[model samples]
Target: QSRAKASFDTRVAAAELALNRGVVPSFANGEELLYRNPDPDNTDPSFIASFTKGLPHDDNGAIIDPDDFLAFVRAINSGDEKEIADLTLGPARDPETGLPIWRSDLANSLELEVRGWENSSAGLTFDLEGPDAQSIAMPPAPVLTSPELVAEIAELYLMALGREIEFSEFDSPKNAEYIQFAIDQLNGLEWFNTPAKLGDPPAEIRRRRGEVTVGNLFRGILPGSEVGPYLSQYIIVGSKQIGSATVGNKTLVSPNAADEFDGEIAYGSITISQRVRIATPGRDFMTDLKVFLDVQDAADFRGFESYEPGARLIRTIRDLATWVHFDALYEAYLNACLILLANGVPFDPNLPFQQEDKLDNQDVFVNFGSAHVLSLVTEVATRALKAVRYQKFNIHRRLRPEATGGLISVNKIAPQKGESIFPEVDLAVEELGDILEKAEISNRKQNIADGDPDPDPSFLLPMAFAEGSPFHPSYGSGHAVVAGACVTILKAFFDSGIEIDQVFEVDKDEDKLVKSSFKGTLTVAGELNKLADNIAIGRNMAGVHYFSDQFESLLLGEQVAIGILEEQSLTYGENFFFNLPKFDGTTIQI
Candidate 1:
């Protein structure tokens, strides 16, 4: 086992190296070094001249011509071990030491050693005597704090909790009235506030303080609001698990409300929609099914926690984008499943089954019952990490609207001469342009005849056509790819140790009867396969993808996601996991 593990480690390392170099088989058999110099032929005269100037004279006191010296240097840089060896050392060696002392070898080694020393000496010198030497240890990052900043954060928290605080209270009576009203509302409720200090506080005290504050606030304000009952119930039920509550004392407010509070807060809301539409196209109809499949597969292998936070963040963002896209596609898949089931697609008798109600009997149902569990697990894990990281980085504060405004503004402006938003955007745009052109050609075959679009113009003609066509709509599939990217990202979060079996329970009849069990197994596979099929089919049915378009888009999206993740991982050190929040009082075991 140990030997096998070691072998696996070696292979992984080799794979990583190859990936970094943008090629496979990064080394040849018996190769001594991994890096290869690009200018092996010394094709440029300037490089040849430079090499000639650096060469040493022979014992005969004759300097070699620049061309020959450049050729020699070029040989060493060729990246071929044999060529390097031949250039550095001729066939013969010194008899006494049994080692080559060829002119090329001595010169190359001396130059390399000098270059090494030159670089290292600079660092060493600074370390020994410069300001860095005096402060070799990194200074702790300045403790983030400011009265205005804290106030801003407080206001944001209030806003998020559905209480908008007025900042310009003295500007007008209305504003002052609003502020006063807010204060009255706040004071009427149970308020708990903790003051920030330079040192850590006791955990139990903090917990108790938080509970008292939360409980009192809910009791005081909720009765007057629409969602008061729900809030009160949640606190009454959850407080025991989250904190110790004072028995029979429901309105205990913390005394530190004015001292500036920092902690978790919760809120709730609901909305009513006038109409809701749900559509699912079958797997055969999906345009870009391959992208979702690739994303799902990739999600299983990504390891964000194994890398640094920045790299992990990038990986997470990419993966999340993919996951979201996949999820949306999955929703479409669900729709397709409904369609398939409605059409009376054959089902395996062995699998467990849920009887459909009359309303759903005709609805298509593709069995995604197994992957659903994995999907939920991934979503929960991803969301948890996002929450944790958001708190850890204080990103809500650091990357606030005010803090990031300048960068955002700069990003909005087009670059002029040598100024680029990102080096890769140009390449991406060019590539996408080519894709769009190809899509245009593909669309030509599917276009409706110009003269045949007069019947049922209101119901079918306008709705069925693409944009810019008399009957068609113009929305392209770019956003679909973007959405798919989101899905890929979320999948990376919970790729480990997720079991499919936990998602389903066997029917009682199947459990009791052995012959019925065989039917159950078939049923399960049939459902899962149907779900997968629907996911692939629904993208095209949704009108966002063509068969070829979906396939190509999926490839492009995955490539884009990979590129973004790889760049981020390279910039940040590996082992940067998503920042997870520590549930203050909870103890967990891995």
Candidate 2:
């Protein structure tokens, strides 16, 4: 009893600590849970407290290094009902001191004693005190999972899946009346009416205690049910679907990994919405320069000033990023399809679409079950973006040009000094000042002068990007690197021939030639190239980067991405292959 009592007490302290910290521990902090909780079923603490010894944790040599070795242990505690329910909801009578119908007193035994918790954030306060934590049991081998208890788990889950139940009220009499009423009231839905396929009793569920929605059906799948485990892996426990995979007969799952569960999240924000809410001041400088020429009594170009790349390409990207961002997933799906096709498993176009679309189709690829290469693609994208940002700031002032009088930017000037790389942009800039404007273009000029940040009196702030180029250096454009890295991985796995669908609409009141919607069947390589060019040139048009900056980074980025893919190929294996045209004539055997 004392041994059991100690485990519960330790758990209570950690649950309370989660109130102060957003993360909770899934391990026994003091006991070196790695071994004690080696396989989920080892509920009792091990005699050994070898902190130095435990399961070999192949911590991602990055996020969980020796310093933050315990960090991953903390991130999963969501402080939500499902996590708590796992702690105390299930019942199993220990044979040594156990009861039959599996009634558990854990509600009281494992009850976390919290003085209070606020919905607000915490201060930088600390206590050198210790903390208690709990670990979910891992069954080394599937035991005789109690049917009677699994039934109750389904019922409790039905109520809690939709956020209908709370922690304390689970065992109280209120839960009883609620269940009975739900059974009778929800009997109309016929949830419990169907006979169990396993020749077990029909789903005895009687009521809809949880939210009744199509999406809820996806979440209400119970454990032990034949198909439940497979589908349950994809449902967002609280807010995120943890990633997992199946290889041959064995399936693997994560505790709370959104990137694994949702491909959209992994490839979405980095590749698609990379520019969302970002403000690049350098972009505005170029825009203002274009319009400033018109206001000046007369304008003349000296040196590289004549060949500026101008703002047209920047505006072109502006019309795209926000409008067609989700399309990034389509690009990722192209690889998903090819991966399945190349690995002797082809996608059933209608089947994958009828169910979860690319979600189901992607997991069938060889890499997912064995190598987890989808995660690698996302990792490359993440690191590439970070590297570019890190270098931009690092490259600061080290490379520079003297700023003109009256303004603050010593930033990027033009494409060149002696001869022009982009002669057309310089020619446009040279011609801009003499032309007297009378159209909406002039209105745009007027607005930039009035509303733009750090109103460059030097030039009237004529940029396509909202905030303009970020505060950083000009040589080695950041966008170019992201393009290079992401594009390379994409090229390796997918066919460039796949036509990208464009279904988004745009505002065209100002531009007469603009279509209501940019509807076209564009290719994969084309769109990715378009995306990269938009970013790189968009920055140049903003006057934050020169041609040299945008041009070299793509090569630099490609090398980095290839190195990353090569490293990732660790066990993606020689057998993992794709014969898509994007891989050139040779088969891509990662």
Candidate 3:
């Protein structure tokens, strides 16, 4: 006990410095490159950093007060908790939740606190930066003018175009012509091969067996990971059948479904089945990017006023975009963990249970077991969020994808509206001109053909959400950071090399998981990496983020998980090591 106090402080100091050295912040320099304004329209880099235009609206459907924009930015930049907490937020209510849907973390942006294992948020004295809050830094978002930014937005356009399209159709002859259109359209981009400016360009995405086709269009991270389509094995396959349990007057089914303890079933009593629930497909919204741009500019948080719905059985990327709760994404990987555990899959051999012969007295758990891993997975998420929040509000303050799409549309229009608004961001719309033309044509055509009324030839990127991107900066996505942190923790705890027993894909018509035709073996590591990609890229599919945000953020979160795991290792007496396979094709042990 006497030595423990000294050692605990020692561990915290070591941990702070360890992370400082391990994850030095890197930037892409777009903040400097694309932010010098010289346009007459006054649409330049100033408000692009944060959603200042996203302030509350009045009953007339207009921004209630124009002064709130700078006031909001002042609150964020101040990083003062009481100041943020005191600020009045949205008077507008979300149509669905009947609750305000403003920025998720304005108050928490400068939150100062500490965990048992962490140094105070005031600052990590050992960090290269002054404090724990500013220790990690995110790269500047891809410049508005850069092809890297253009390609990301273009992919989102492709995703919105094909939202309801089944994964199976991409590879099969079913939607062959439509799929090839997407492939050729993407391949035509200058970033695709000319210089490969974007992250994971089509030229670099290695499909299984080195075969290229429509199916390989928008897949994500890891080497030789092209076993199948863009969607992850976790999302595309399996369904959760929750336990139906009764208490006094209430019946509980699953987590986050129908609630309250007034007469509710015990949280522990409600059992969840291993398989995932079949998610309903999503309907496309705001197909005319121009319409969405207006809505985005005001930051209106409403939904389904002019609603029509989608009718396909299969769960697509939209499912991932829509269905997240607090710690729910991490809960998903834990659900995946349980599925593997039930099949008698072993943990990593480095753990005592796998190596020690004396299990009769010493059981597996606590310091080197499920509870520890579970705690770590969820714990890393908040830290990851804080790191990204600092990046989002304090540093990068990048504009959302919806905002970028508006820039593209206005610049590419016949009579340019905001072209060369920012001298540095004198957007090179010439490169992406053809792609936008095709997307606009197809967008209007699809909506009209789908019985949409008043479809217009607007070049704004269509959005999945009625309200458009959330009230926050665009870079270092909240979801992607959490996914990276959680997935990295899972990789550290599990046996990444273990091959999945059998892999499946959703039968769009039948609405069930069926064995996939992909012949390559799916491993725990690869699928875990795929899971991170699915969650990160799924936001893009919803027209909210870009490729660099997800890719760079994943690495950032990975660094967070590793730093925490390393610190935790010092607390444990067991001789255990967490062997983790990174999203990038590399391995590390802690």
Query: lDDT winner among the candidates?
Result: 3
lDDT of 3: 0.57
* Candidates in descending TM-score order: 3, 2, 1
Model 2 regions lying over 4 Å from their true place:
1-317, 320-374, 386-457, 464-467, 499-521, 540-543, 578-590
- Higher-TM-score candidate among 1 and 2? 2
For model 3, residues 84-110, the per-residue Cα lDDT tens digits are 555545444457755444322211232
TM-score: which candidate is best?
3
After TM-score superposition, the amount by which residue 494's alpha carbon in candidate 1 deviates from its true location, in angstroms, is 2.0
Candidate 2 structure quality by residue, lDDT tens digits, 1-590:
59677656654544454334432221112222322322355453221211111111121001112222132122112434343233221122346544211111221243312111110011111212211111111011100122221222222222211122221222236455544443432332323333334543222221112342222221222111111111111011111122434556886553434332222222222311112222222222233432231111011111111122321111222222221222242233233322222222322222112134345444434553313335544555544544343333222111111011001111113222232221212322332221212112332443454454443223222333222223233334455555555555554545444553321111222211112122444444444444444444334433334333443454345444554554444323233433222211232333
lDDT over C-alpha atoms for residue 391 of model 2? 34
Residue 563 local lDDT, model 1: 31
lDDT per residue as tens, model 1, 1-590: 59788666655554463245342111111111111222356332221101111122222111223343344445433434454334322223357755333332212232211110001011112111001111111111111121222222222222212111111112236445534433443333221233434453232123221222221221111111111111111101100111222336573443422111111111111111111121111111001111111111111112111211221100111121221223533332222222222222322221123234353343212231234322322232222222112111111111111111111112222242234331212322232232223222322222222211221111010101011011011111222222222223222222211112211211222211011111122222222222222222222222222222222222223223333333333332324331111112121111
User: Which pairs of residues clash in candidate 3, taking residues 3 or more apart in a chain or in different chains?
Assistant: 123-131, 123-132, 124-132, 239-275, 239-276, 240-275, 240-276, 240-277, 289-460
lDDT winner between candidates 1 and 2:
2
Per-model CA lDDT versus the true structure: 0.22, 0.29, 0.57
* Model 3 misplacement above 4 A: 1-7, 10-23, 26-46, 49-74, 81-133, 195-215, 236-282, 288-294, 297-314, 323-329, 356-360, 414-428, 441-456
lDDT of 1 at 341: 28
